[PDB]
């Protein structure tokens, strides 16, 4: 059994979804410890993990899978597949309009074009579970792209991306070249870069040939490029994450709410501006020796600092969390979780009528969230909403923010279940006002596929 198939078999045997995510990440960068990586490597240095096991990623994705996909799926050029080549230091993208038929795709490949499958998690269930699990321990949307490059060619021009990248070598081999940020502003860059020329590059901080099973990681801002050399192709899956998940992006949300609150809660922010500040403030006065100017700058800095006291941190935290539930891919359930959830109720059609009907939750029912990264309780204008991911499409934002309102009489209980994971809770023990308030919540959650009972229900 390939390491992937074994580790997956292992994840299914692990009760906690938080532990699965961790365990799977452990597997990804092994033998390297996750602890060491996140403390020293993450967002700091480029990393290569020479696996020395060409079967490591067996079962994940193959070129054959791609061939079957272009054939059995509606793979659209430009929408799902990108064919491109790099020659003369010029990046060219020859994307035929319409569906990417095997004949056309392989013709481009034969012509020296690299094929990049944009959303593999939409067509591959194995890749979906991979990312769906990894996103949990990343605390950020985990996406990926598959790259298939033909022998003796380069599909893309050197550049850097806006996400943390984990390159997995699936088939063949490729010569990689990774550079450290060229300048300060390029370190952990915010947006992807344009296509670069070899003239814009310095010396590689790492240059190596990736073999099936290897993992090459590098932070956003790190320029890179790859190519095939011997008469062998290359296939890799680049897992990416942490897009716009920086401190600056958190402040973007904070500030407006801060300044607003500061004005409503502090008269200093409601005081009027100087009647003649335009006399010493402005581009045409960046040099004025007017004291009132220095006082102005000082008052601004003093007020800016004072905002830290009015920052709605918990609010922005929940919003980002809400947005994360929205960006998330649907949860991949373990046989255990399924059989114990609404999804695994034996009620189906047989003969001429529904069989095994009547599963009812009871006060004696022990329950707990189906998983730890599927729901998030968020307040908004006296209203409390429980956002979940169980109804999300494998296609990013193909669906919209799904939620259900939580009435105050349940808030405490709902808040409990979210923190008690994965500890079983007797429904009759939920902190509500009435027995009808515990069953209504538990029932409303179970049927929605957000809860799982300790034992299957047969009432």
């Amino acid at each position: 059994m390939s390491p992937l198939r074994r580790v997956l078999a292992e994840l299914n045997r692990i009760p906690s979804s938080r532990r699965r995510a961790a365990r799977l990440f452990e597997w990804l960068i092994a033998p390297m410890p996750p602890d060491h990586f996140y403390r020293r490597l993450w967002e700091r240095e480029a990393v290569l993990v020479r696996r020395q096991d060409h079967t490591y990623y067996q079962g994940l994705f193959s070129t054959a899978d791609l061939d079957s996909m272009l054939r059995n799926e509606e793979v659209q050029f430009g929408q799902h597949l990108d064919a491109a080549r790099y020659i003369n230091g010029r990046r060219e993208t020859l994307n035929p309009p319409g569906r990417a038929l095997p004949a056309a795709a392989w013709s481009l490949y034969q012509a020296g074009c690299s094929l990049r499958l944009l959303c593999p998690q939409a067509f591959s269930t194995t890749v979906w579970q991979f990312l769906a699990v990894l996103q949990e321990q990343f605390g950020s949307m985990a996406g990926s792209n598959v790259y298939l490059t033909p022998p003796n060619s380069q599909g893309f021009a050197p550049h850097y991306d806006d996400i943390e990248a984990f390159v997995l070598q699936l088939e063949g081999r490729k010569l990689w070249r990774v550079y450290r940020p060229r300048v300060p502003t390029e370190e952990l860059a915010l947006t992807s870069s344009p296509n670069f020329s070899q003239d814009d590059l310095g010396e590689p901080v790492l240059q190596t040939v990736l073999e099936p099973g290897d993992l090459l990681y590098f932070p956003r801002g790190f320029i890179h490029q790859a190519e095939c050399q011997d008469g062998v192709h290359s296939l890799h899956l680049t897992l990416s994450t942490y897009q716009r998940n920086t401190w600056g992006d958190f402040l973007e949300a904070i500030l407006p709410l801060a300044v607003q609150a500061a004005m409503e809660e502090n008269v200093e922010f409601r005081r009027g501006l100087p009647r003649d500040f335009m006399d010493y403030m402005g581009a045409q006065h960046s040099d004025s020796k007017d004291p009132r100017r220095t006082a102005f700058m000082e008052k601004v800095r003093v007020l800016v600092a004072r905002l830290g006291h009015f920052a709605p941190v918990d609010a922005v935290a929940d919003q980002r969390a809400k947005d994360f539930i929205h960006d998330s891919l649907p949860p991949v359930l373990t046989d255990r979780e399924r059989a114990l959830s609404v999804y695994g109720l034996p009620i189906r059609w047989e003969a001429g009528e529904p069989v095994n009907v009547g599963a009812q939750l009871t006060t004696e029912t022990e329950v707990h969230m189906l998983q730890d990264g599927i729901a998030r309780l968020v307040g908004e204008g006296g209203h409390l909403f429980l956002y979940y991911t169980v109804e999300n499409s494998r296609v990013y934002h193909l669906e919209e923010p799904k939620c259900l309102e939580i009435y105050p009489q349940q808030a405490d209980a709902m808040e409990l279940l979210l923190g008690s994971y994965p500890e079983f809770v007797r429904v009759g023990d939920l902190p509500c006002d009435s027995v009808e308030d515990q069953l209504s919540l538990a029932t409303t959650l179970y049927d929605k596929g957000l809860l799982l009972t300790k034992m299957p229900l047969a009432l």
Binding site: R91, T93, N95, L118, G143, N145, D162, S192, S240
Partner: peptide
């Protein structure tokens, strides 16, 4: 001159 890794998958 086409783009690079497409993270969000919209596309």
């Amino acid at each position: 001159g086409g783009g690079n890794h497409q993270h969000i998958c919209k596309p």
